[PDB]
Design a protein around this motif. Structure first.
Motif, PDB file in Angstrom:
ATOM      1  N   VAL A 112      -6.355 -15.381  -8.298  1.00 17.06           N
ATOM      2  CA  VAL A 112      -6.826 -16.587  -7.634  1.00 17.06           C
ATOM      3  C   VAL A 112      -5.623 -17.243  -6.976  1.00 17.06           C
ATOM      4  CG1 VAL A 112      -7.910 -18.825  -7.909  1.00 17.06           C
ATOM      5  CG2 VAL A 112      -8.715 -16.887  -9.244  1.00 17.06           C
ATOM      6  N   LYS A 113      -5.677 -17.392  -5.660  1.00 19.95           N
ATOM      7  CA  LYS A 113      -4.625 -18.048  -4.894  1.00 19.95           C
ATOM      8  C   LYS A 113      -5.238 -19.275  -4.238  1.00 19.95           C
ATOM      9  CE  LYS A 113      -2.851 -13.450  -4.131  1.00 19.95           C
ATOM     10  NZ  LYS A 113      -2.631 -12.356  -3.152  1.00 19.95           N
ATOM     11  N   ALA A 114      -4.875 -20.452  -4.731  1.00 20.96           N
ATOM     12  CA  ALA A 114      -5.465 -21.696  -4.271  1.00 20.96           C
ATOM     13  C   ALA A 114      -4.375 -22.700  -3.933  1.00 20.96           C
ATOM     14  CB  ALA A 114      -6.408 -22.286  -5.317  1.00 20.96           C
ATOM     15  N   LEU A 149      -4.720  -3.793   7.738  1.00 17.50           N
ATOM     16  CA  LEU A 149      -5.032  -3.043   6.526  1.00 17.50           C
ATOM     17  C   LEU A 149      -4.793  -3.975   5.344  1.00 17.50           C
ATOM     18  CD1 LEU A 149      -5.738  -0.467   4.963  1.00 17.50           C
ATOM     19  CD2 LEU A 149      -3.329   0.157   5.089  1.00 17.50           C
ATOM     20  N   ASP A 150      -5.870  -4.532   4.805  1.00 14.11           N
ATOM     21  CA  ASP A 150      -5.800  -5.401   3.639  1.00 14.11           C
ATOM     22  C   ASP A 150      -6.234  -4.620   2.408  1.00 14.11           C
ATOM     23  OD1 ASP A 150      -5.443  -8.202   2.500  1.00 14.11           O
ATOM     24  OD2 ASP A 150      -7.522  -7.826   1.931  1.00 14.11           O
ATOM     25  N   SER A 151      -5.461  -4.736   1.334  1.00 11.25           N
ATOM     26  CA  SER A 151      -5.765  -4.023   0.099  1.00 11.25           C
ATOM     27  C   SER A 151      -5.337  -4.887  -1.075  1.00 11.25           C
ATOM     28  CB  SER A 151      -5.062  -2.667   0.060  1.00 11.25           C
ATOM     29  OG  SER A 151      -5.507  -1.895  -1.037  1.00 11.25           O
ATOM     30  N   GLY A 152      -6.299  -5.291  -1.895  1.00  8.60           N
ATOM     31  CA  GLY A 152      -6.001  -6.082  -3.069  1.00  8.60           C
ATOM     32  C   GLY A 152      -6.252  -5.328  -4.355  1.00  8.60           C
ATOM     33  N   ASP A 153      -6.900  -5.980  -5.313  1.00 10.15           N
ATOM     34  CA  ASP A 153      -7.243  -5.337  -6.571  1.00 10.15           C
ATOM     35  C   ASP A 153      -8.579  -4.614  -6.506  1.00 10.15           C
ATOM     36  OD1 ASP A 153      -6.241  -5.067  -9.398  1.00 10.15           O
ATOM     37  OD2 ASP A 153      -8.195  -5.946  -9.843  1.00 10.15           O
ATOM     38  N   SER A 191      -1.462  -6.000   4.501  1.00 13.14           N
ATOM     39  CA  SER A 191      -1.717  -7.244   3.797  1.00 13.14           C
ATOM     40  C   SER A 191      -2.244  -6.936   2.404  1.00 13.14           C
ATOM     41  CB  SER A 191      -2.717  -8.112   4.570  1.00 13.14           C
ATOM     42  OG  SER A 191      -3.123  -9.232   3.812  1.00 13.14           O
ATOM     43  N   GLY A 192      -1.937  -7.819   1.462  1.00 14.67           N
ATOM     44  CA  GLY A 192      -2.451  -7.716   0.113  1.00 14.67           C
ATOM     45  C   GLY A 192      -1.425  -7.166  -0.862  1.00 14.67           C
ATOM     46  N   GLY A 193      -1.742  -7.335  -2.148  1.00 18.95           N
ATOM     47  CA  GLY A 193      -0.825  -6.922  -3.195  1.00 18.95           C
ATOM     48  C   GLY A 193      -0.646  -5.422  -3.295  1.00 18.95           C
ATOM     49  N   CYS A 215      -8.805 -21.355  -0.913  1.00 20.74           N
ATOM     50  CA  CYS A 215      -8.902 -20.549  -2.122  1.00 20.74           C
ATOM     51  C   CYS A 215      -9.149 -19.101  -1.731  1.00 20.74           C
ATOM     52  CB  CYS A 215     -10.016 -21.059  -3.038  1.00 20.74           C
ATOM     53  SG  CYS A 215     -10.211 -20.108  -4.560  1.00 20.74           S
ATOM     54  N   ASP A 216      -8.219 -18.229  -2.093  1.00 16.69           N
ATOM     55  CA  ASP A 216      -8.306 -16.797  -1.830  1.00 16.69           C
ATOM     56  C   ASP A 216      -8.470 -16.095  -3.176  1.00 16.69           C
ATOM     57  OD1 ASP A 216      -8.134 -14.184  -0.916  1.00 16.69           O
ATOM     58  OD2 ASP A 216      -5.958 -14.251  -0.692  1.00 16.69           O
ATOM     59  N   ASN A 217      -9.717 -15.883  -3.579  1.00 20.46           N
ATOM     60  CA  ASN A 217     -10.038 -15.183  -4.820  1.00 20.46           C
ATOM     61  C   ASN A 217     -10.542 -13.791  -4.448  1.00 20.46           C
ATOM     62  OD1 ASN A 217     -12.311 -17.613  -4.458  1.00 20.46           O
ATOM     63  ND2 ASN A 217     -13.193 -15.552  -4.598  1.00 20.46           N
TER      64      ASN A 217
HETATM   65 CA   LIG Z   1      -5.825 -10.082  -1.527  1.00 17.94          CA
END
Ligand SMILES: [Ca+2]
Ligand SMILES: Nc1ncnc2c1ncn2[C@@H]1O[C@H](COP(=O)(O)OP(=O)(O)O)[C@@H](O)[C@H]1O
Ligand SMILES: Nc1ncnc2c1ncn2[C@@H]1O[C@H](COP(=O)(O)OP(=O)(O)O)[C@@H](O)[C@H]1O
Ligand SMILES: Nc1ncnc2c1ncn2[C@@H]1O[C@H](COP(=O)(O)OP(=O)(O)O)[C@@H](O)[C@H]1O
Ligand SMILES: Nc1ncnc2c1ncn2[C@@H]1O[C@H](COP(=O)(O)OP(=O)(O)O)[C@@H](O)[C@H]1O
Ligand SMILES: Nc1ncnc2c1ncn2[C@@H]1O[C@H](COP(=O)(O)OP(=O)(O)O)[C@@H](O)[C@H]1O
Ligand SMILES: [Ca+2]
Ligand SMILES: [Ca+2]
Ligand SMILES: [Ca+2]
Ligand SMILES: [Ca+2]
Lengths: 366, 366, 366, 366, 366
Positions: free
Chosen positions: B12-14, B144-148, B291-293, B5-7
């Motif tokens: 939410v990515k499960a 370099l990870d970047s999400g919300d 990495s990331g959205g 689970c990647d929240n």
């Molecule tokens: Ca992410």
């Protein structure tokens, strides 16, 4: 069993919850003799006042959805229970209807009379436009209800009401009847008394229709006589009317005909949708539900479709839902609601009314 | 089988360890009605809240990688297990992810809920950037990870992390969405509610891109209209945006647009490399993993390549690794890690959690 | 066949007796990770530690010719036998080297490990400067050997050593590397870690040289920039050094640069010759043999020639023998000695070690 | 009268020779507005920048004892002379301080500015640790000076310096502040901006202390809350910190906390003593002089005493001299030196600077 | 002399720079006859439209701070210059005001009309909240400005604006007037036309006040009649209102009364302060400046003080600055700014407008 009474302004529609049609439908009028008797009741109610209207002064106790004559309103409720339905109101919970944005004292006084004069075991006052959505089997839609006294728009989405978007207009059937009486004088027909107003109302319901394009219709009516129709008065006189057939309902779309500043029912419907959240407008555009006697004009759904389409974005699907029985939609929806097992907790019983007082009647009142 | 689970903050990515893609991907939102019902759940989660957002107030329980509403976070975990994955969490070890340099109590409270509310047999909290390196099949690189919610840089060399060089920036997708809402008012578009924020986020993901040279792009956008694109709102209204397409992602490289003092993601990446030993910088320069959205903007890898090349010595080979599926890199890397035979000793079982207490969750926590 | 291993302090030079060059040449280092792993050996040896030095702490087990870390020294011997030479040490007699005037326990512990850990059939510990004379095909000469840890002078005449004239100085390559690191801070270059020390050592071997006249060279370096050279660091940064090129090797001739009271290698060589009998000094003056990596600076033989000529009587012929392969002279001389038929009686076998004990290793030990 | 200016890295301490305390003490910062003005100086210096730091980006022109921003350094010198001391620098010889093993160009550029921009009649650049020994009235001792940028050990015996034993470590107050900012995120406190770094520095100076035994202190902090203290932020928010109070100064004794390979200040002090001649070590053991703001932690002298005692032979008397005013020891020692009649020949006058050029500034520079 | 015109949404406030009060204050309305004439101007503006509103349809050309009817806006500007001020606009530089975060085209079109229709020599568009700070003689404070169309918060510190903390809410006086019209129907009072909206606005300004505690006030209004007041309509009818007096202004603190999702003005003020740097929050807490007509309710400063005190830390001093003349603060501040000698360089002259084009008007526009 529950009683469902829909007393809008012009008609009393009363029956039993679970039925498909109201048992008693009669005008909400009280007539009193305006001459002196020589050969004799004090007052006449409903259809009885309508058949003797020649020697009566007819009064509507409800004006613009607001009960103004409470003694006459009790006469109508009394005749509805004992003469038309022939029941004991102390044995049946009564579901009543009301227009939104009414004075608070109207519902409070109506509750006090039902509990202290008729001694009903429980009662509930619903909003008329919400019941119309029950009748159509929908949970989402903007209801345009228009009776004799009031026209109102209530948008509902997934069972949630948007009270801030509720619009009310004091232009309805009675104002159209008075406007038809005014423009009938252009042809030399003089209707002035309260009895003659009932004749003009019958003319309106028989001959009036909504023009798809008002200006093109006015040119056709001025070009020939293909739009003219005749109507026989009760005394045998035959009157002929032409453009008055569609000029009277046009007031719904152009309230300036009777000196009102407000916009027509198409713009009011559009403005109500535009006050709602942007994510629900698409569903409201496709679920315009028309309700009430004043929406029974031929061609009104096609005109509403055309007018709202011109206001809405071109990619929206405008759909006007005008069922054939929409004159009874409020009563039918009230019959469905009063028969729901989930609704049986919403009744205001006589016991909890003596405790909380008149303040308890204003729950789910927007 | 293990659950991954990647929240992060926004989604939410499960799914199940061993798969190539997460089974359930839905927004990490809880919606509650902001109007009163008249015809009705208390709350809506995920895609259900997204489809009814017109009558809801949407809340993200995770803000800047930190869980702020724990009751809403349990609702999301509950729906993930029982409604989306449809499993019993007491039968599957659960691999969770977290941003580095988070508060210690965030992981401790998350562990207490997984063991006492869902009764998972074992669990593990990995760092998101480390999993992204697993997904790319590398042992060396700066991720370099970047999400919300959060953007972070984690350099890794030959399987060893350099925690002193880890950089974290509370500027990510949600801050870009809020900035786009602000600059959309320049064209007369007003998005204010939490439901309209979801519309602006969809606009951002469709039309926004990273300009290779920001000042030359601003001149092109001011010269003609070749950069302008249209977007149809849910209600049918069509909006047109020009330089807002690349001004919104430019905040990643110029955080002063939203009033932040920090340097852009290019300088943060360079500063993280320069905190590492001089002998590993060459390998880090050639293995910049995105990495990331929030790294999914068109042209962001070419812009990062150009910016870091200008900062690094001219003889270094700057290589940005931006795989097409990098939006799921953290989940894919967690799926690979949870399927390793060497990892099966790293699980924190329910037994050793009742003994060591909450202190056991902070192993390999940098 | 015999194994010849020359582990001075900085490099391991190992091969087989009879060859012309050592088979394995790698740094005598053990590296251990100074960060924690997240994705992993416990230690790295030799060239493997040199390539991963970015995440390692590098340790030399030999300091100033004395083995200080015996567990790390066994790791290096183990990798030399099994990984670099790929032989079984129980099948080959091993010739080891040592600096003169070392602690007795260093050779005893080295013998105990070769016989009890590696089970060599026989072994022998020679003196490094004596082997350098074998490599040059001479029986008379004063050998100046200088590696990473120790510099020593050993005069030999007609095959006879003069132990009372042996001089040892704990100033060699490692002290020059540390001094270059210190004076590189004058130009703003900061090398502090054990990994950066390996970079400075590479700078020293590429750019440093011995000035023929130090004061005239300092004036030339201060007058223009004809002596400045550039060096590219592993990360692409380019450094430029001027007088540091010859100030670093000048410490060999002026040990006061690093705070040592001793005289330079020229005076130490002269003092060693002057401790010898007057009848052999003429032959020693003409046979100054230079050996080891620290004698590989450009211009050191011309400087030694000039300095000793100024100290010796004007009628003596000073001749510095600096062969091009003098970095391997100790190993080459050990390869020649271990292949002599006369030497086969000098082996210390495993049998005579269990009888005489550790005392047997100190024969021909000066 | 002579001016004594001690600009280490974090603070400017300036006054007149002969006084007991510096006249002006203010942060060595330059602040520039990071927002745009609407109602306004270009830059703010010192205490003025500290009071308006909310809308400023604060920059230190000195980093690790090396002046990196020379235009900002001139602003600070200008405000020191004209605004804080209110003197004409062309009438006073100026004694400046510097850390040992600094780049040569730092002192040369500092001399060129003092002679050509401020036109001082004479100047001198002393070493900071030597002045600290003047302040304590000693001629023998090893000075451990630690400010905001650099920590260095300088052993002095009977007035003679031992430059080969001088040790410099780029770990000081600013690195401890950055480490406290990092570990404060464990409790959910986020300090990121340059203005918030000044808040964390104030937290460090109020609440941080050196634990006598670090592992026993970590157990006490994990057992109860007797070590926790509160601190009120400028906005009224109250933060509570526990083991962060002694984990931050522990970096001085365990530099691996911030990823540095070097040994702590206790081992560096011991290694510096062990590089000195054996006959002076006893006097150095009894005269460990601590100097600078970073030595002002409660309990640091007792910890240094305990650590060096464990490294030194049991018969040596370890004595840490930590005077209460050791934060101003460098300035006080410079005030004493600049008032000595023997020192008046050591001034570098403007005349002999135009003759010898920049080379004259490197006398007694180790 | 300069002209200062503050046309927010409801009122036009115009005068000359240097005066203490605006010369002309009249409603920003255009009225057109909604009946046909029989005995007659085409349109009426300002006070003239207000006195004949019985036969007019009144339109505000500005809605929510955005000019929507540009032909009517020119009529108002024309009457302001020639009829109210009686000046030639080609002889006076004109300072105009605007709400922050307005559409860019609003200021550009307003500039094009002032330069091409009225031919002003120079003009400038200031932000309304910044001028309010000039009026109070402050350089630091968070201004809460609220007029008829828009409410906005602008924090300013030491003359620097923090644009990222600027908050704008489309809830102001006109929305409160519409809400009062809605809840007046609870007592049977029906105000629907644009002329009756002006009557309700006059009722709001006379009788409405802010309750210190809303729930305790609702209990007092339901307990007795001590809160009820009477108001005589223009036709002599007397209406009485009770809790509607404080329910209407309560919408400012509970925007959900009118279906808005946003937080009240107290939380918006607090959220704006919390977006600012931590070092300036204390000064912002003590300098809450209220401005505009919608802040003129009795008891609003005490309610704001109470609400923000409950949100801020207990040690902060919350001070609401509500001057008695705050209805003219924007105009008074504009009168001060237009009279500053430092401001005379900020005018946008007609010459530099023909060169740079419309792009020049967006300087200091946040
Ligand atoms: Ca992410
Ligand atoms: N066929 C019709 N065409 C036009 N108007 C009609 C028609 N039937 C009824 N009406 C009008 O509808 C009004 C009554 O509407 P209704 O909703 O049935 O009752 P109420 O007004 O009591 O709610 C009357 O004014 C009547 O004139
Ligand atoms: N194609 C796209 N372009 C730009 N931004 C995107 C795109 N797709 C997703 N995003 C942004 O990425 C953010 C979510 O990132 P992600 O890492 O997938 O989840 P989380 O933030 O939960 O870790 C959202 O704010 C979203 O707006
Ligand atoms: N070309 C060169 N110039 C100067 N110094 C060198 C050169 N090559 C090697 N060295 C130095 O020689 C030292 C090693 O000497 P060597 O005798 O080969 O090994 P060991 O010290 O192990 O006996 C190292 O310190 C290295 O820096
Ligand atoms: N009471 C204290 N406790 C811990 N650290 C302190 C204290 N007072 C000052 N410091 C630190 O000392 C550093 C400055 O040292 P100082 O020698 O006075 O100036 P400089 O660094 O300019 O030479 C700053 O980083 C400051 O945080
Ligand atoms: N005494 C008062 N009490 C409450 N509201 C007032 C009062 N006076 C004016 N207002 C309201 O303020 C609004 C106008 O505010 P103002 O800032 O003066 O002008 P503008 O809205 O044009 O900027 C109007 O909606 C008006 O109803
Ligand atoms: Ca009806
Ligand atoms: Ca050697
Ligand atoms: Ca200092
Ligand atoms: Ca205003």
């Amino acid at each position: 069993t529950a009683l469902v009474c829909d007393n809008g302004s012009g008609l009393v529609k009363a029956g039993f919850a679970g039925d498909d049609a109201p048992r008693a439908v009669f005008p909400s009028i009280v007539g009193r003799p305006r001459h002196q008797g020589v050969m004799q009741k004090d007052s006449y109610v409903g259809d009885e006042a309508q058949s003797k209207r020649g020697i009566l002064t007819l009064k509507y106790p409800i004006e613009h959805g607001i009960i103004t004559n409470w003694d006459d309103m009790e006469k109508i409720w009394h005749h509805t229970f004992y003469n038309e339905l022939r029941v004991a109101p102390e044995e049946h919970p009564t579901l009543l209807t009301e227009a939104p944005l009414n004075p608070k004292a109207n519902r409070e006084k109506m509750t006090q009379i039902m509990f202290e004069t008729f001694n009903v075991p429980a009662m509930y006052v619903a909003i008329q436009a919400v019941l119309s959505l029950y009748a159509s089997g929908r949970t989402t839609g903007i209801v345009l209800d228009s009776g004799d006294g009031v026209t109102h728009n209530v948008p509902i989405y997934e069972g949630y009401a948007l009270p801030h978007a509720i619009m009310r207009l004091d232009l309805a059937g009675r104002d159209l009847t008075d406007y038809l009486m005014k423009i009938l004088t252009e042809r030399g027909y003089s209707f002035v008394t309260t009895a003659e107003r009932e004749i003009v109302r019958d003319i309106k319901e028989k001959l009036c229709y909504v023009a798809l394009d008002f200006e093109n219709e006015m040119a056709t009516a001025a070009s020939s006589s293909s739009l003219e129709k005749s109507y026989e008065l009760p005394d045998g006189q035959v009157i002929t009317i032409g453009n008055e057939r569609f000029r009277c309902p046009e007031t719904l779309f152009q309230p300036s005909f009777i000196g009102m500043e407000s916009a027509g029912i198409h713009e009011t419907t559009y403005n109500s949708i535009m006050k709602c959240d942007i994510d629900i407008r698409k569903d409201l555009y496709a679920n315009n539900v028309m309700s009430g006697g004043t929406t029974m004009y031929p061609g009104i759904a096609d005109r509403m479709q055309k007018e709202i389409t011109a206001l809405a974005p071109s990619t929206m699907k405008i759909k006007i839902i005008a069922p054939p029985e929409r004159k009874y939609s409020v009563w039918i929806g009230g019959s469905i609601l009063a028969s729901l097992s989930t609704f049986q907790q919403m009744w205001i019983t006589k016991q909890e009314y003596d405790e909380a007082g008149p303040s308890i009647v204003h729950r789910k009142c927007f």
